[PDB]
């Protein structure tokens, strides 16, 4: 179909990469260095996508907050925050219920929960643009250290405050608001340029992902672990979120979901929600006909907070080892895993290796060794390419609901 060139090219690249991964792996053998060199275009595409995160997040968030009126912004943010909280709680509850029902497992926390508050208020803005803050205790004195990795939470709250102040100032801040308004358009144009090269990177990324698997034995060893996660994802994406859309807005959500499936394909191939955010803009804001200010406000905050699938994974995979590691279920034990998983879901970054570093917190919450990550770690990657879809749907669904709630004020 004409005018669907991007979607058709992405589908063709995906199927070609799947064919390459299923063919070249069994008809040849490559060393680890050759496997690394095979996925070089995918690495270049990832790097190009990560390059655009810094100027897009701040510009879009500042524009979204300063575009609205002085009083409407606080109320809209309140609805968005409460929506995110309810969705995360529902996701954790559903994941816990499923992992407990299927029971597939038959066969330093106070210094990490405080790091979120220490990261929301960075000491230096330029350092927070490319570095994070991590604290450790040693003999027992608290020692601070700065590690590499872009800080998104502190930047996001800084954009919140800056946009609110600029909107309050009014005429004096007009130059500063037009600057970021132009920056947002320039960044969107750059993302549109990257769209041209993205299919080839997607093809090579999929091929490299299929190649790196070892013997397919881990598929059978931890098959139930994949099954519970996929069932939870399907339930959360088909039964709960469409239900809330239909209850709030008397429209069918399936056309809304299917129209923007290109963002789903891109995110699922690149296994990242923060990096796919510009694609989420390009799809939702110009296909589902949602307000620009709403998408420039709800999506940036929900890109790092609305991580439903992450929280579901924390819950299911923590109760998995709670069953496996010579332990039994506990009533208050379920509650502490739910709370810790919610906090880690709020506390996790938008990178494909996330969900493991924040996993240690919820593993130690129930008093278990930190070395149990090596259990599901083998399939932990192959599966993390499936936790972003529900995040993208959650943000897109939230945009329409918050638009409907505040239609009069818009």
Ligand X SMILES: N[C@@H](CCC(=O)O)C(=O)O
* 268 and 206 Cβ atoms separated by less than 8 Å: no
| CB closer to Na ion, 97 vs 224 | 97
Smallest gap from residue 362 Cβ to ligand X (A): 12
With a CB cutoff of 8 Å and minimum separation 6, the contacts of 24 are: 207, 211
d(CA 19, CA 31): 20
Interaction partner, residue 209 (ligand X, Hg ion, Na ion, none; CB < 5-8 Å by kind): Hg ion
Asked if residue 355 binds ligand X (CB under 6 A), the reply is yes
Asked if residue 20 binds ligand X (CB under 6 A), the reply is no
Q: Which stretch binds ligand X (CB under 6 A): 221-229, 234-242, 332-340, 351-359?
A: 351-359
d(CA 363, CA 365): 5
Within 13 Å of residue 334, how many CA atoms lie on the same side as its CB?
A: 14
* 287 and 7 Cβ atoms separated by less than 8 Å: no
| CB closer to ligand X, 122 vs 394 | 394
* 135 and 142 Cβ atoms separated by less than 8 Å: yes
| CB closer to Na ion, 272 vs 391 | 391
Asked if residue 209 binds Hg ion (CB under 5 A), the reply is yes
| CB closer to ligand X, 20 vs 338 | 338
First to last CA, the chain: 35
* Count of other CB atoms within 10 angstroms of residue 105: 19
Asked if residue 241 binds ligand X (CB under 6 A), the reply is no
Is 32 known to sit in a ligand binding site?
no
Is 387 known to sit in a ligand binding site?
yes
d(CA 5, CA 7): 6
Smallest gap from residue 301 Cβ to Na ion (A): 10
| CB closer to Hg ion, 6 vs 389 | 389
Both tokens of 165, joined, read: 């102040």
* 50 and 275 Cβ atoms separated by less than 8 Å: yes
Smallest gap from residue 64 Cβ to ligand X (A): 21
State the DSSP H helix or E strand holding residue 138, giving kind and residue range, or none if neither: strand 131-138
What mask, x for binding ligand X by CB under 6 A, covers residues 370 to 409? --------------x--xx--x------------------
Question: Is 204 exposed, middle or buried (CB count within 10 Å of its CB: 0-12, 13-18, 19+)?
Answer: buried
| CB closer to ligand X, 177 vs 379 | 379
Both tokens of 296, joined, read: 């420039």
**Angle value at C-alpha 99, between 97 and 100, nearest 5 degrees:** 65
Applying CB under 6 A, the site for ligand X has a residue count of 14
* Count of other CB atoms within 10 angstroms of residue 12: 12
Is 87 known to sit in a ligand binding site?
yes
Both tokens of 257, joined, read: 């979901």
Applying CB under 5 A, the site for Hg ion has a residue count of 3
Asked if residue 381 binds Hg ion (CB under 5 A), the reply is yes
Interaction partner, residue 381 (Hg ion, ligand X, Na ion, none; CB < 5-8 Å by kind): Hg ion
* 352 and 272 Cβ atoms separated by less than 8 Å: yes
| CB closer to Na ion, 310 vs 323 | 310
Q: What are phi and psi of 271, to 5 degrees?
A: 50, 60
Is 101 known to sit in a ligand binding site?
no
Interaction partner, residue 63 (Na ion, ligand X, Hg ion, none; CB < 5-8 Å by kind): none
Interaction partner, residue 350 (Na ion, ligand X, Hg ion, none; CB < 5-8 Å by kind): ligand X
Interaction partner, residue 279 (Na ion, Hg ion, ligand X, none; CB < 5-8 Å by kind): none
User: Tokens 């990177």 sit at which residue?
Assistant: 201
Report the binding-site residues for Na(+).
84, 87-88, 302, 304, 306, 308, 345-346, 348, 391, 395
**Interface contacts to Hg ion, rule CB under 5 A:** 209, 381-382
**Interface contacts to ligand X, rule CB under 6 A:** 271-273, 307, 310, 348, 350, 352, 354-355, 384, 387-388, 391
Report the binding-site residues.
84, 87-88, 271, 273, 302, 304, 306, 308, 310, 345-346, 348, 351, 387-388, 391, 395
């Amino acid at each position: 179909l004409k005018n669907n060139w991007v979607l058709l090219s992405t589908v063709a690249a995906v199927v070609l990469g799947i064919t390459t991964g299923v063919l070249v792996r069994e008809h040849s053998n490559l060393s680890t260095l050759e496997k690394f060199y095979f996925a070089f275009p995918g690495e270049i595409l990832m790097r190009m996508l990560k390059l655009i995160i810094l100027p897009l997040i701040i510009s879009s968030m500042i524009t979204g907050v300063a575009a609205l009126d002085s009083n409407v912004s606080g109320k809209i943010g309140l609805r968005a925050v409460v929506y995110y909280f309810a969705t995360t709680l529902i996701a954790v509850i559903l994941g816990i219920v499923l992992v407990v029902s299927i029971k597939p497992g038959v066969t330093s926390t106070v210094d990490a929960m405080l790091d979120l508050i220490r990261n929301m208020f960075p000491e230096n803005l330029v350092q927070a643009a490319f570095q994070q803050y991590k604290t450790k205790r040693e003999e027992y004195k608290i020692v601070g250290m700065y590690s590499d990795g872009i800080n998104v939470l502190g930047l996001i709250v800084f954009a919140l405050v800056f946009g609110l102040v600029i909107g309050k100032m009014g005429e004096k801040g007009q130059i500063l608001v037009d600057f970021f308004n132009a920056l947002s358009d320039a960044t969107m144009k750059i993302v549109q340029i990257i769209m041209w090269y993205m299919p080839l990177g997607i093809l090579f990324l999929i091929a490299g992902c299929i190649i790196e698997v070892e013997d397919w034995e881990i598929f059978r060893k931890l098959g139930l672990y994949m099954a519970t996660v996929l069932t939870g994802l399907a339930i959360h994406s088909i039964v709960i979120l469409p239900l809330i859309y239909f209850i709030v807005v008397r429209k069918n959500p399936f056309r809304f979901a299917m129209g923007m499936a290109q963002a789903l394909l891109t995110a699922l191939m690149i296994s990242s929600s923060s990096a796919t955010l510009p694609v989420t803009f390009r799809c939702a804001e110009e296909n589902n006909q949602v307000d620009k200010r709403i998408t420039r406000f709800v999506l940036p905050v929900g890109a790092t907070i609305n991580m439903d699938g992450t929280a579901l994974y924390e819950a299911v995979a923590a109760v998995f080892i709670a069953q496996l590691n010579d332990l039994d279920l506990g009533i208050g034990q379920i509650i502490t895993i739910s709370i810790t998983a919610t906090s880690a879901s709020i506390g996790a970054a938008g990178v494909p290796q996330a969900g493991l570093v924040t996993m240690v917190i919820v593993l130690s919450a129930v008093g278990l060794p930190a070395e149990d990550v090596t259990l599901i770690i083998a399939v932990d990657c192959l599966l993390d390419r499936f936790r972003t879809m529900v995040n993208v749907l959650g943000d897109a669904f939230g945009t329409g609901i918050v638009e409907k709630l505040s239609k009069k004020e818009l």
